[model samples]
Target: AAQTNAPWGLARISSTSPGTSTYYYDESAGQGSCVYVIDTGIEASHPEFEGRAQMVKTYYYSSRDGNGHGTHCAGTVGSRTYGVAKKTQLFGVKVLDDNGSGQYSTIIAGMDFVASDKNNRNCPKGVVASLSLGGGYSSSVNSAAARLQSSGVMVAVAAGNNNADARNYSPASEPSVCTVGASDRYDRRSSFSNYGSVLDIFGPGTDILSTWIGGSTRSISGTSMATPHVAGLAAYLMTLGKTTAASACRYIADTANKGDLSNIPFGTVNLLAYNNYQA
Candidate 1:
């Protein structure tokens, strides 16, 4: 399986520091934010992430590697050393096991937990949920995501690596959700990235370097990797007083690298000029 890595722009920032200094800087400064990663569980003790990860809750509906996909996705979003949002809080909800498979109902239950958080006062406010996994588009998943949107939580979904239109999937296809596509270092769409009229934006997804389990490091590729970049950027915008999902989405669409998606067929759906909306 291909693991996701960080974008070159973010890596340039991390490379400027010596030893663990980069991780420390991100943990203390960077951007103050929080996000919910709904996938496999994360390795909470890695050096790059120690004292950085904030676990709101973790649960597995099936028996399997609880940390595989979740950890990778978490590291991409908020790992102290290798992630994009070093100072951001991460909430891990494991709906899929190590084998990268889970039932839709189980996944829906996890979404409900993050959306309701009925008992925890410390639960993060103004959070954006990042989901890297996707199956066939289900009505239940779409409805749940819509509910989450109505509750003030912004949901970001991967466009998938199937090379097909993203409208084929649930959360990615849903109108209320923000669907992200994959781009490479050259700013062109990744060959494996799914394209469609539903795509909201594109981010670095090819050969991303990020934290892995057990203090190891590796590079992976997928639209899944690209999803977190948008999530982190959304958190950054939220901290800058861009509160509503529409504003945040608009900010990204108005500010992100625009030329990258201009020639693409899904012109309107791919918010190419998002970087211009920076707060």
Candidate 2:
């Protein structure tokens, strides 16, 4: 019931047309839901989060993020100025290190944390996990994500940035998670975004501006950036009663903007993410 001057990605999802400049979101979008940002740590003090973001787990060190990837992804998930699910709680699960890289073992640890917390008393009405980091095929990580989904936490993962077949990557290649690829403002597949039938949907990832470390903002590109947009949408759908992982995934795909993207490879689903809100 409110509107904001939005980034291209935000505006793009809320409208069928490509050039909108405003995002209209329900007043209660993502209320009572939570998103686990499984990545480099988050700068929770960033004002864009409005006190809703916090670090919930650490692998081996202080959960402070020297790298800015997690903060940016968290911003797109729930920041007041650059978010999809504006009111969703953001829980940072530190898995990647300062260089934006991590072993699959640590990634699985973050996924396991979400599964454990989902059964706790502190859990919210619905849960989602935003995974913007991925590498080569890792059976351990894939299995962990599947288990997390079984625990009712909707998981969204990057389809890697290799610009190759997404099926070659882990977690993205994993069948259980919502694998996402990147699209530019012009509805073209981002040059660096991986493709293939493995990708569940496409989201705006090119030159995306979001909250960064030091309470700042920056624009970047990657399938990593595209993932949290779908994660936030999953959180929003949960608030609308698509509470289960399977139901939310089906709904998002069914409601996507079909045949809208250009230059997508064959076998890739032609659906682009949408909020179904027209204003």
Clashes of each: 20, 0
Q: Runs in model 1 with CA error above 4 Å? A: 1-32, 58-67, 118-125, 266-279
Residue lDDT tens for model 2, 235-274: 8878767546666777889899999999988889988999
Which is the leading candidate under lDDT?
Answer: 2
Per-residue lDDT of model 1, residues 1-279, tens digit only? 111343463542223221122121222222555678887766667677766664555455442224566677777777765666666677767777777777888788888887786235242335778888787888898788778767777788898899888777877787788888886655567788888888878776777777776667777889888888777667655655555555666567765554544335644354431222211
C-alpha local distance difference test of each model: 0.66, 0.88
Q: Extract clashing residue pairs from model 2.
A: none
Cα lDDT for residue 69, candidate 1: 62
